Amino acid sequence: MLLERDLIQSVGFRNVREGGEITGFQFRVRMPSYRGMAASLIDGIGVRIPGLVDVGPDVPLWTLQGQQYTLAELWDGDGVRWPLEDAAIIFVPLPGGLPDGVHELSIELRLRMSYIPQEHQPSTYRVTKHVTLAPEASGAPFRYGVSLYSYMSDYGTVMDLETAMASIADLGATGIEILGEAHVPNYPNPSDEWVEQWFALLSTYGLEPTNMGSWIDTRLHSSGPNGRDMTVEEGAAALQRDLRLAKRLGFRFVRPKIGVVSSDLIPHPIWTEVVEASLPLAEELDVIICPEIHSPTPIKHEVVDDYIALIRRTGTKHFGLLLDTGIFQDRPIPLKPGELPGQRPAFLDGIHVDPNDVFDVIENVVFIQAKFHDIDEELDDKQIPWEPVLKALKDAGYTGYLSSEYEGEREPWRSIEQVRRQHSLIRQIADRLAE
Amino acid sequence: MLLERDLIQSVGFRNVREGGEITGFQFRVRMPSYRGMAASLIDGIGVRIPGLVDVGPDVPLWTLQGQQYTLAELWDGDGVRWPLEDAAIIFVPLPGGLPDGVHELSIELRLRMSYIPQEHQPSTYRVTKHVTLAPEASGAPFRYGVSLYSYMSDYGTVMDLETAMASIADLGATGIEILGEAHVPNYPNPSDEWVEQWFALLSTYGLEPTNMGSWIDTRLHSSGPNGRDMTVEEGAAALQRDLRLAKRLGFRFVRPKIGVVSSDLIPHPIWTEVVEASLPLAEELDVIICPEIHSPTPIKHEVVDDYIALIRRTGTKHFGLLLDTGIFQDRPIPLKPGELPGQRPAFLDGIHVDPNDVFDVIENVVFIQAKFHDIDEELDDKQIPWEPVLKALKDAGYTGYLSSEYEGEREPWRSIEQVRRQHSLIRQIADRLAE
Ligand SMILES: [Rb+]
Numbered sequence: 001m002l003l004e005r006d007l008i009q010s011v012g013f014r015n016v017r018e019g020g021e022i023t024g025f026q027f028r029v030r031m032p033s034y035r036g037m038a039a040s041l042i043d044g045i046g047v048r049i050p051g052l053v054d055v056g057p058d059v060p061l062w063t064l065q066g067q068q069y070t071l072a073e074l075w076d077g078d079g080v081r082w083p084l085e086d087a088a089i090i091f092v093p094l095p096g097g098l099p100d101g102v103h104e105l106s107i108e109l110r111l112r113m114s115y116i117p118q119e120h121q122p123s124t125y126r127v128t129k130h131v132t133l134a135p136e137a138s139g140a141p142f143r144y145g146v147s148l149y150s151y152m153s154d155y156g157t158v159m160d161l162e163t164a165m166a167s168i169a170d171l172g173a174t175g176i177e178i179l180g181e182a183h184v185p186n187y188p189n190p191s192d193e194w195v196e197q198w199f200a201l202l203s204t205y206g207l208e209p210t211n212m213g214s215w216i217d218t219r220l221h222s223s224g225p226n227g228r229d230m231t232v233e234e235g236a237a238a239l240q241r242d243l244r245l246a247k248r249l250g251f252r253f254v255r256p257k258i259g260v261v262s263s264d265l266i267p268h269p270i271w272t273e274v275v276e277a278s279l280p281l282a283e284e285l286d287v288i289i290c291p292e293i294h295s296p297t298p299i300k301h302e303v304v305d306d307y308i309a310l311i312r313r314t315g316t317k318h319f320g321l322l323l324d325t326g327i328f329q330d331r332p333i334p335l336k337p338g339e340l341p342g343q344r345p346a347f348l349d350g351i352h353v354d355p356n357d358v359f360d361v362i363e364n365v366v367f368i369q370a371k372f373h374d375i376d377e378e379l380d381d382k383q384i385p386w387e388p389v390l391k392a393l394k395d396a397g398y399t400g401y402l403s404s405e406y407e408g409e410r411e412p413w414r415s416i417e418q419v420r421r422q423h424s425l426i427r428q429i430a431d432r433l434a435e
Numbered sequence: 436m437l438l439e440r441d442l443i444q445s446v447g448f449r450n451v452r453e454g455g456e457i458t459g460f461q462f463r464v465r466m467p468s469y470r471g472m473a474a475s476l477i478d479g480i481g482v483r484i485p486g487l488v489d490v491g492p493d494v495p496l497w498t499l500q501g502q503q504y505t506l507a508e509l510w511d512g513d514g515v516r517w518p519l520e521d522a523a524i525i526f527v528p529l530p531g532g533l534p535d536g537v538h539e540l541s542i543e544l545r546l547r548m549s550y551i552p553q554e555h556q557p558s559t560y561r562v563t564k565h566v567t568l569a570p571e572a573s574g575a576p577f578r579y580g581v582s583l584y585s586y587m588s589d590y591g592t593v594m595d596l597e598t599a600m601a602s603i604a605d606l607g608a609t610g611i612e613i614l615g616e617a618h619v620p621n622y623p624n625p626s627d628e629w630v631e632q633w634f635a636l637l638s639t640y641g642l643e644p645t646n647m648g649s650w651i652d653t654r655l656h657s658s659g660p661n662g663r664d665m666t667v668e669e670g671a672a673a674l675q676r677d678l679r680l681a682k683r684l685g686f687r688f689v690r691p692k693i694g695v696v697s698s699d700l701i702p703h704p705i706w707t708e709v710v711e712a713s714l715p716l717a718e719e720l721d722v723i724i725c726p727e728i729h730s731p732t733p734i735k736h737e738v739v740d741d742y743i744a745l746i747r748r749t750g751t752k753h754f755g756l757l758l759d760t761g762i763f764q765d766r767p768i769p770l771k772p773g774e775l776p777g778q779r780p781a782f783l784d785g786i787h788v789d790p791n792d793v794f795d796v797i798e799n800v801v802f803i804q805a806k807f808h809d810i811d812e813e814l815d816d817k818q819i820p821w822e823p824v825l826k827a828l829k830d831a832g833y834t835g836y837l838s839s840e841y842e843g844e845r846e847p848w849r850s851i852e853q854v855r856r857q858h859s860l861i862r863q864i865a866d867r868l869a870e
Pocket residue numbers: 292294324369371405
């Protein structure tokens with residue numbers, strides 16, 4: 001599993017419990033040196049969170065190669081290593097632990113290198129990082145998930161499948177959402193070895209597959225001299241192909257994103273018969289087809305009405321709505337340097353859908369993508385008003401998943417902290433709404 | 436096989452031959468979309484290097500899932516994909532190809548996303564990047580290698596073993612040097628599965644194991660109340676342990692980095708008996724033990740003298756010198772962000788060992804780490820006078836390996852371009868000395 005660039009890992013920063021009582025907190029630390037080394041060459045790690053934690057270098061305990069040691073023990077041990085491929089697991093004794101949130105964590109790590117003169121030893125590594133503790137808030141009655149979409153650009157450059165699931169598991173989330181043509185290697189023909197490993201990974205990290213995103217690419221052959229549009233039979237043969245893939249990998253929902261014909265994203269006219277021809281298979285496989293309502297499409301709009309009209313006309317219970325919470329965005333996505341007003345579509349400033357608009361549709365809202373862009377060290381989201389959305393969603397009786405779709409700056413590793421902040425934010429709000 | 440963050444990869448930028456004549460050049464491109472896509476949704480890639488190439492998007496050829504297509508074929512095909520996990524391989528027809536060096540590649544890649552309104556399509560990505568062509572120059576008489584030490588910090592965060600080896604093979608290097616306690620997982624007990632895959636990888640990428648870095652950590656238990664010192668028998672057991680590991684993994688050299696007791700970096704007193712107690716096993720395994728001359732130790736120093744004195748008092752052919760080319764640094768490493776003029780270590784400004792001093796040691800020089808810090812887009816190395824170093828090495832008769840050891844700023848991915856520039860510069864210089 002790959003390690004984060006920052007020596008202080010975001011993943012694993014959590015309170016530690018024994019028989020129900022919280023005994024302290026841990027975090028993980030990637031070895032800074034160019035090699036793993038003998039554990040006895042460690043000279044400790046001072047830890048500080050201002051106002052909550054302040055301990056000298058010999059106090060934290062070290063879990064290395066499956067066992068926990070004091071520093072005094074590390075000094076006298078033989079054969080124990082801090083292997084380069086493992087983050088060191090640092091436990092800090094703190095009864096009751098740490099409160100939910102983002103915490104500015106400062107470490108002073110000391111390592112003895114025998115090939116360096118004593119007048120420059122030990123080697124000392126000082127770093128600080130705002131890190132998000134795994135959420136203590138329950139978050140009832142919502143179910144908590146993460147889409148691998150949240151890790152776009154990270155995935156495949158700094159992140160692999162096992163690393164992302166480990167990041168999702170640590171958040172206390174239970175649901176993983178994926179994009180079929182993104183995260184299924186050799187799509188649409190994943191190897192038997194890949195699939196076996198997929199279910200092993202779900203078992204290991206306690207995750208269940210939720211939504212698998214898929215496409216109906218109507219413009220498949222729109223270019224060149226022999227251009228053509230996509231037939232109904234081709235649309236459904238593709239949708240059916242992704243329903244079976246989904247079932248095979250254990251997903252309950254499939255979101256086909258359909259090619260559009262207009263500014264506010266009216267799907268291609270083949271969309272209706274493509275879905276209708278696909279509903280028998282989705283019922284047979286027990287998979288729900290849920291198209292996505294995303295900005296600039298609001299809840300009150302002819303495309304939602306037609307989706308709901310399909311539900312009435314067919315009678316089906318394997319067709320539903322997937323909401324993207326960017327329809328609720330009430331503050332603008334920032335301008336980048338060099339851009340100026342009017343150079344971008346209106347909806348990027350937010351279409352401010354009234355969260356209550358979910359009341360009249362909620363019965364058909366089967367899945368929710370918790371889209372967001374930026375959440376700071378104080379758990380302040382800069383675009384999505386989470387309290388009213390959640391209030392409305394709760395009062396309306398929604399009890400399904402909220403699946404993180406981070407879509408902020410794709411700076412390397414940024415998405416890991418961001419997803420963590422969203423889960424800490426949302427679960428805390430859900431708990432205060434219960435009161 | 437992770438991909439580099441820049442959309443234009445450095446690995447795979449090379450001239451392309453068929454029956455000896457260069458037909459053009461290729462580069463590799465990471466899919467920027469959040470998914471892999473059917474190949475017919477590609478609308479082409481424009482390519483430019485000022486003064487060398489300027490082609491429109493319908494001209495480059497595309498290799499995808501094992502086969503090469505024109506754009507017009509991609510538009511008409513079915514079932515071919517640009518998988519998210521595969522960089523696209525872009526071929527630009529150009530008889531004679533490109534000269535050696537860094538080139539400023541600008542691409543204009545277009546993609547058709549059906550779910551986005553026509554007035555905002557095709558989706559377009561313009562990036563420019565300085566990428567170093569895989570060396571055309573011979574580089575004889577030296578042999579060319581890379582130490583995974585060059586990829587420190589990237590290794591384990593953005594890079595794994597196979598990705599590293601792919602990058603070394605593409606450079607046309609043949610030798611891979613590793614650090615045992617860095618890159619052997621579960622050191623010192625790699626699994627039979629990892630060892631088998633190691634040998635699979637080397638065969639696949641045409642690489643040969645050269646040097647395994649190793650340590651004798653005399654300060655193993657220097658801290659705590661029960662502090663002690665490393666005995667000869669423990670030191671020799673640690674060396675003999677790395678000798679066996681290196682043999683099992685197929686290396687021919689082991690560089691023990693012995694803990695020091697002073698600022699001229701005089702090894703710990705036990706070093707002589709540790710080595711003498713280890714020469715039979717290195718002889719029985721046919722592995723050479725070569726300690727490393729690193730700055731601030733010059734060639735003209737008791738440390739080097741005692742090394743050569745050991746060779747002669749023992750008669751061994753399994754003890755040698757490893758030279759680190761930083762001892763030849765004639766210009767200063769720049770002041771790190773925020774540092775103080777003078778507070779840094781002294782030798783980091785370079786100790787300027789005369790390149791001719793290799794004539795007196797060359798008969799016992801078995802391996803050379805090509806330490807460098809920074810080489811810019813015109814192949815200007817800012818620290819290491821390569822031409823006199825390389826000319827001295829050639830006139831002294833050295834025909835061994837020059838193993839890259841990038842030690843510049845550890846910006847994510849920067850080591851990749853840096854090593855490629857290193858091999859391009861040196862192979863080109865070497866070729867001029869052949870005249
Ligand atoms: Rb979405």
